[PDB]
Amino acid sequence: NPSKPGRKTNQLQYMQNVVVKTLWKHQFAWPFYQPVDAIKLNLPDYHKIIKNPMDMGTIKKRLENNYYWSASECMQDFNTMFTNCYIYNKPTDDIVLMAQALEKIFLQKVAQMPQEEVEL
Amino acid sequence: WWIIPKVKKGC
């Protein structure tokens, strides 16, 4: 949980208008649009193994509602989303390749992000 | 969508 009320910042606007937008448009992003539905997907022990679920739809909603105080918290949510995927799933699963491809784009956009955070 | 969830997609 954040330690301060959220803000609008140059870095958070970049996460919303560059990072989320570029990831969402790829045809392999769809498994990350919504929380993992472990009932419909019949995923045994998903919530026993994954204690902090996260998805890109939740991240997008948090950005639009100014939930985050800093883009560092948003980047951690993306990291949680990818790490959960690798922890729960099997090496040869389709989902792992899809996460790897999205995570590479995520890191590329983080490398290109403005390095200081200023409130808007 | 999934043929087998997480393992193999159908789309």
Author numbering:
A (entry chain A): 28 to 147
B (entry chain C): 1 to 11
The authors write:
Sequence alignments of the top 500 sequences allowed us to divide the peptides into several families with distinct consensus sequences. We selected the top two hits (members of BRD3-BD1 family 1 and BRD3-BD1 family 2, respectively, indicated in SI Appendix) as well as the shortest peptide in the top 50 (the seventh hit and a member of the most abundant family, BRD3-BD1 family 3, which accounts for 28% of total sequencing reads recovered for the top 500 peptides; SI Appendix, Fig. S3C) for detailed structural and functional studies. Among BD1 domains, peptides 3.1B and 3.1C displayed little selectivity, with affinities of each peptide for BRD2-BD1 and BRD4-BD1 within a factor of 2 to 4 of their affinity for BRD3-BD1, the domain against which they were selected. Five intermolecular hydrogen bonds are formed in the complex (including the BRD3-BD1 Asn116 and 3.1C AcK6 bond characteristic of bromodomain–AcK interactions) and 1,100 Å2 of surface area (across both molecules) is buried. This is low compared with known protein–protein complexes with the same affinity (1,500 to 2,500 Å2 is typical), pointing to the high binding efficiency that is accessible from cyclic peptide libraries of this type. Another notable feature of the structure is the high degree of internal hydrogen bonding observed for the peptide. The carbonyl group of Ile4 forms a bifurcated hydrogen bond with the amide protons of Val7 and Lys8, the Lys8 carbonyl is similarly hydrogen-bonded to the amide protons of Ile3 and Ile4, and the carbonyl of Trp1 forms a hydrogen bond with the amide of Gly10. In the structures with BD1 domains, this AcK lies within a channel formed between conserved Phe (in the loop following αZ) and Asp (αD) residues. All of the residues in all three structures that contact 3.1C are completely conserved, consistent with the very similar affinities observed by SPR.
Within this class of proteins, the bromodomain and extraterminal domain (BET) family contains four members that are transcriptional coregulators and that recognize acetyllysines (AcKs) using a tandem pair of highly homologous bromodomains (BDs). Despite heavy academic and industry investment in this area, the generation of paralog-selective inhibitors has proved elusive because of the extremely high sequence similarity between the bromodomains of family members (90 to 95% within the acetyllysine-binding pocket residues). Using the highly conserved BET BDs as a model system, we conducted three mRNA display-based RaPID (random nonstandard peptides integrated discovery) screens using a single library (which contains >1012 unique members). Crystal structures of 13 distinct peptide–bromodomain complexes revealed highly diverse structures and binding modes among the cyclic peptide ligands.
